[PDB]
From a paper:
The [name] family of oncogenic proteins is important as therapy targets because of the frequency of activating mutations in almost all major cancers. All family members function by signal transduction to the nucleus of cells via interaction with effectors (such as RAF, RALGDS, and PI3K) that catalyze phosphorylation of downstream proteins. When [name] is bound to GDP, the protein is in the inactive state and becomes activated by nucleotide exchange from GDP to GTP. Mutant [name] proteins remain in the active state and hydrolyze GTP at a much slower rate than wild-type (WT) [name].
As a comparison with the KRAS169Q61H crystals, we also determined crystal structures of WT KRAS188, mutant KRAS188G12V, and KRAS188G12D (all isoform 4B) with a GTP analog ([name]), using crystallization conditions similar to those described previously for full-length KRAS188G12D. A further comparison was carried out between the switch regions of the two full-length [name] structures ([name] and G12D) with our new KRAS169Q61H structure (amino acids 1–169). Both KRAS169Q61H and KRAS188G12V lack stabilization in the switch II region, and this instability could be attributed to the lack of a Mg ion binding to the switch II.
Numbering used by the authors: 0 to 61, 67 to 171
Write the structure that this text describes.
């Protein structure tokens, strides 16, 4: 078996967690909203010449300790027209560090819905927060597929760097 990576997608209700994950796995988008309880998915990919098995947990917007314990890296999603969702990232991250007992947990900040018109969260404020945390920031649109593969592949790169360092 090729290296397995356990990725967990977290963020507020309605930000696009499910829409990003379904683009990655099935290559389509839907407008209809079906709220998530707890979903999981598996996908084989090649990243930087290496075959990876991605094991993805797609979490509910509104159980937390257990997924924080199992995940190796976290996709922290907000929507660019949802100020509260952006503010919520601080609270997710604190809960993660506390569960892992560690200042260093692989994470990627994702600002989704970049296809929409009136953004209430600006790029600079998100870039600033990612610089503070020492993690990457990626803008995405699950509607168009812009950035989707980059978001997940970057998270795997962050997990690889963390194993190297911990060694
Ligand atoms: N314009 C646009 N709409 C999107 C985008 N991503 C998701 N949406 C829309 O936003 C709504 C919520 O998407 P969804 O994937 O269900 O969000 P979620 O974060 O999984 N919700 P939950 O926490 O309840 O499981 C749907 O109407 C969906 O089509 C996007 O990038 N752009
Ligand atoms: Mg969902």
């Amino acid at each position: 078996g090729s290296t397995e990576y356990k990725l967990v997608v977290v963020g507020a209700v309605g930000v696009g967690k499910s829409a990003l994950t379904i683009q990655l796995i099935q290559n389509h988008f839907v407008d209809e909203y079906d709220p998530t309880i707890e979903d999981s998915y598996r996908k084989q990919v090649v990243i930087d010449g290496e075959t990876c098995l991605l094991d993805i947990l797609d979490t509910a917007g509104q159980m937390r300790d257990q997924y924080m314990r199992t995940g190796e890296g976290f996709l922290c999603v907000f929507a660019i027209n949802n100020t509260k969702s952006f503010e919520d990232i601080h609270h997710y991250r604190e809960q993660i560090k506390r569960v892992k007992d560690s200042e260093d947990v692989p994470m990627v900040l994702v600002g989704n819905k970049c296809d929409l018109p009136s953004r209430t969260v600006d790029t600079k404020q998100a870039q600033d927060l990612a610089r503070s945390y020492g993690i990457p920031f990626i803008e995405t649109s699950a509607k168009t597929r812009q950035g989707v593969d980059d978001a997940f592949y970057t998270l795997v790169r962050e997990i690889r760097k963390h194993k190297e360092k911990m060694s």
